[PDB]
Design an enzyme around this catalytic site. Structure first.
Site, PDB file in Angstrom:
ATOM      1  CE  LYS A  11       3.999  -1.729  -6.819  1.00  0.00           C
ATOM      2  NZ  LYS A  11       5.401  -1.653  -7.241  1.00  0.00           N
ATOM      3  CE1 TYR A  51       7.881  -6.968  -8.741  1.00  0.00           C
ATOM      4  CE2 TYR A  51       7.650  -7.661  -6.442  1.00  0.00           C
ATOM      5  CZ  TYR A  51       7.414  -6.735  -7.460  1.00  0.00           C
ATOM      6  OH  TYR A  51       6.730  -5.570  -7.216  1.00  0.00           O
ATOM      7  CG  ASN A 114       5.774   1.789  -9.056  1.00  0.00           C
ATOM      8  OD1 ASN A 114       5.457   0.907  -8.269  1.00  0.00           O
ATOM      9  ND2 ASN A 114       6.403   1.546 -10.187  1.00  0.00           N
ATOM     10  CG  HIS A 117       2.142  -5.816 -10.613  1.00  0.00           C
ATOM     11  ND1 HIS A 117       3.429  -5.948 -11.103  1.00  0.00           N
ATOM     12  CD2 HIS A 117       1.333  -6.723 -11.222  1.00  0.00           C
ATOM     13  CE1 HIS A 117       3.367  -6.903 -12.017  1.00  0.00           C
ATOM     14  NE2 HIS A 117       2.120  -7.408 -12.123  1.00  0.00           N
ATOM     15  CD  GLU A 128       2.115 -10.690 -13.344  1.00  0.00           C
ATOM     16  OE1 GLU A 128       1.103  -9.952 -13.392  1.00  0.00           O
ATOM     17  OE2 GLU A 128       3.260 -10.321 -13.714  1.00  0.00           O
TER      18      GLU A 128
END
Lengths: 150, 150, 150, 150, 150, 150
Positions: A11, A51, A114, A117, A128
């Site tokens: 990310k 998402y 975080n 992913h 994905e």
């Protein structure tokens, strides 16, 4: 079975913190094979699709905004049990609760930042990968170290 | 909340084994901010105060003797959930039972030579920091990487 | 007690993948002392003896074939709780289930190519060491870092 | 001779980039002994004194401003040939010309943001140590690994 | 040509400082193949033979005493230009003058405690290997990573 | 000036040896910014164009064959003096002569399997980037760590 694949995305915070090479090295050392790789700044549409599962939740707008806030390094790894194995290497949602040795355990402090992913399942991995990559962008002929599989 | 602080001390064995830089790097990589830092040889009084909670136990004399046996690197780190997070990074009291990836799991073998000290709670962290450092020695203006917090 | 010893063997896949130095370094950093060390290509007899406990099982032939398929780095380490500690550092039988931070968790993917062997008990450690090494090949005078034991 | 000392300072950019532990570890691995250590935000006066040698030059104002712009980790290391050895480990003034393996060669790109300061001579080391540290802050009894010196 | 071999010995100080795994890993990463390996405490005779070239010099007694003062890890590596390449990886006689990135540059400070021995030529490599190892102890069938040689 | 860019390609041997993450990490640690990144199997035409400068030489056919023999990780880095700096980090044509600390010095042994490609000049960097990447694939808005540039 050893042809299982997972989608990983470093990310914006991870890219900005210079953790791309460190993350890829962990997966290469493990024995997984890099099947797809590219840096990009996700558009809103790809983000919303990625998402989509949270599109009814409140935090969904925050997820879309952040992932599109900067470059992202998307990659696809191949190997036996890669999907679950990659999640174990990443840690848990909250970096503070992630064990030392895992990616989030070693480098993260905030759920919202975080770092990475990882698909949570084979079916999500399939969706994905097909979402983030064109087939032309994935290796068709994969060959891992012969000292990896029995 | 992201202003939480913990007290860490690299004990004499850790300093003597050349593990100071390795320990600091683990906390910096995680995203915690170094707020205080200095090397010193603790006096008996500071030692007895640090371990005051055990002053009624038999092993208390052993604790005081060892920590004053040589230089110690005292430090204060700041970040969200730092107190619990730092303990998780250290491992458990017995190094042999500490998981690989943690400080004691990677480098220690004996409970008595367990390398590092980490406050076990916010209140103990507060008491220890104020015990080991003068306010002048702590950063007042703390700024972590902006890619760390949401 | 601090004279406990364990037998470790970097199997053919681990040697072929260039993981020998990485594995030894993990044990040296922990504080265990290298007491015996040599590279060899195990003969069928030593192999069958090493895995004698499985001689009635079907997979036994596979174990013997693989360990004799190439060079192996056999070593004996000494330290307190070394036998259990070394197993914790290795991980579980299935590399995919081994936690990040452990040897198999960091580098393996297949049960059949799990990189390393560690005695599962003191008695098996004793049998294996005496099986793999002549007494002349083991250090009699062992001295660890004095900052390791209380 | 093995009592030679040098002054090192991890400048504000190095501290801000989380390179403190990485830098200390390099010196500990080499065998030098940490004799003094503390984090501080230099005042203008200490800064002007540290760079007094350049007080007639134009860039002097820039040097003073930067070193006082944030926390600095000052340290004193002891060992044989430490002064010259530490400079070799750091690299050259221009990070881009510093060889891979050296601190500036591995982590820096700009002369103005060159991460660390190392005394250029014994006499400058003596002046800087006495400038940055009170005698009470330095170890008087130094003992390195016995496997370091003949 | 790619069958060239060199003799390396991690001297007593290197073994005592826990640098065995770190040294082997550097050679494995480079692509050289481990052909012989064993830990031993050299006898006076093997020592005197190893340093026979200096038997007329004064320091010769010191060399023999030190190498026999404790365990030594002897190894033989195979690869193209291994003899010269291994010397370049080690550094120069004086560790303080060895460049960062080399073994002695990263870990040593004293000529007398310089961690490792590397043959200085093919002929000395041949003499040393035959001196330190029985033919039975060396791999006859060597196979490096196929991605190493053209 | 701090907008200078270079083209790097992790060749098939480097990708096959699991050195992609290790190579990227070295450049990220240095402070250079990843501006383009993707894995691909070069076609003959792109290959012939990349090595067009050697199209009259005999070894040209060998260069084209090898680079098209498997996946390649192409990347573009941005920073001050990146072109020359990246070459210094790579080492010299012959890996055996490359100094420890450099990419080829640490991991290579054969000129023909030298792991990575780095543009040798700004003009070649410009030609290669435009050759290997579509403009859409490169970051237009680049922002490095503010602690990197004065």
């Amino acid at each position: 079975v050893n042809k299982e694949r997972t989608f990983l995305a470093v990310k914006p915070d991870g890219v900005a913190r210079g953790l791309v090479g460190e993350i890829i090295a962990r997966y290469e050392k493990k024995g997984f094979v890099l099947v797809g790789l590219k840096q990009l700044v996700p558009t809103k549409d790809l983000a919303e699709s990625h998402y989509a599962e949270h599109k009814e939740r409140p935090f969904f707008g925050g997820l879309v905004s952040f992932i599109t806030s900067g470059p992202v390094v998307a990659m696809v790894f191949e190997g036996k049990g890669v999907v679950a194995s990659a999640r174990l290497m990443i840690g848990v949602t909250n970096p503070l609760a992630s064990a030392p040795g895992s990616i989030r355990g070693d480098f993260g402090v905030d759920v919202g930042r975080n770092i990475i992913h990882g698909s949570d399942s084979v079916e999500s991995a399939n969706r994905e990968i097909a979402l983030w990559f064109k087939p032309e962008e994935l290796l068709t002929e994969v060959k891992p170290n012969p000292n990896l599989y029995e």
